Structure 1
């Protein structure tokens, strides 16, 4: 079911070719579509008019076909530019664009071949079952607001820990993971805890 576009392109091209072949055998307001029978059964004066009508009809059909082919070629060129941009920005590196190359956090992509197309295999990073905790903006120890360098403050009910906000990895809160930026007077909700000291 993922091969819809690759088959639809070929189906549309085949339909256009068949429609052109069918229009090749139309009257366009003439006695017969076959031109040799027309020029052999009628006089040169009327044969000229019949040939002119057939030529005008076939020329209009060919112009419509060329216009449709130009539009389809422009669409295919846009799609190919998008595919080349994706190949250059996702396969040969690691993009930070959300919902661009895969659903989630991008890790790596594997390019594959396909008839008149390219297939990508985006390897992503999807989280799993979650757990609720209690947070705090800062921590007051000696009248100084301790803000974490890289991570969050997680309390399991009785003790406080510091962990990165992508995985449950509780660590002991110390001064090597936080920095002071003033006193405990402006931050709203700064709780009092104990900061370890090396």
Structure 2
């Protein structure tokens, strides 16, 4: 009668030890994550969005803590955002062009090329897009004029 409850409590303690080991594994994973975040935010300016804090990273500062590392992330969040109609690719007499270092942004009548972090209307040129086959495989076809002064 005593050994029955002994075995029950041994099973409970085994479950507790399993939970503690899983917590230790998660803590080691979080330590690796903190180490790589330190390496990518303090020793360099990472271009990843919402990685060194919340927004576009500019500079980070490390702070010591008991069983942890505190990071002082200095960033800028988007104050005012505007929705724009985008397209996967354009078509100017065949040779469908897809945007590089940015996406196609249209305000209603004209299409421009700009990065997704700031709004800068730029004319579509050959140095801003790359040709990809023809306007058949690429789903989504819009007709525009690719200027090149």
Q: Say which of 12, 31, 34 aligns to 1:80.
A: 31
Q: 1:192 to 1:116 in 2, by over 3 A?
A: closer
Deviates more, 1:57-66 or 1:75-84: 57-66
Q: 1:64 to 1:127 in 2, by over 3 A?
A: closer
Deviates more, 1:113-122 or 1:102-111: 113-122
Q: 1:103 to 1:156 in 2, by over 3 A?
A: closer
Q: Comparing both structures, which one devotes a greater share of its residues to strand?
A: 2
Q: 1:183 to 1:94 in 2, by over 3 A?
A: same
Q: Flag structure 2 segments of 5+ consecutive residues without an equivalent.
A: none
Q: 1:128 to 1:70 in 2, by over 3 A?
A: closer
Q: 1:87 to 1:130 in 2, by over 3 A?
A: closer
Q: Say which of 92, 103, 106 aligns to 1:152.
A: 103
1:9-61 deviation digits (Å, cap 9, x = unpaired): xxxxxxxxxxxxxxxxxxxxxxxxxxxxxxxxxxxxxxxxx999999999999
Report the structure number with the largest CA radius of gyration. 1
CA distance in 2, matches of 1:140, 1:58: 71
Q: Give the superposition deviation at 1:124.
A: 2.4
Q: Give the superposition deviation at 1:134.
A: 1.0
Q: Give 3-state SS (helix, strand or coil) of 1:129's partner.
A: strand
Q: Comparing both structures, which one devotes a greater share of its residues to helix?
A: 1
After TM superposition, the score normalised by the length of structure 2 is 0.64
Q: Give the superposition deviation at 1:178.
A: 1.0
Q: Give the superposition deviation at 1:103.
A: 2.8
Q: Give 3-state SS (helix, strand or coil) of 2:11's partner.
A: helix
After TM superposition, the score normalised by the length of structure 1 is 0.50
Q: 1:53 to 1:86 in 2, by over 3 A?
A: same
Q: 1:114 to 1:54 in 2, by over 3 A?
A: same
Q: 1:130 to 1:114 in 2, by over 3 A?
A: same
Q: 1:116 to 1:155 in 2, by over 3 A?
A: closer
Between the two structures, name the one with larger relative contact order (CA 8 Å, sep ≥ 6).
2
CA RMSD of aligned residues (A): 6.2
Match of 1:42 in 2: none
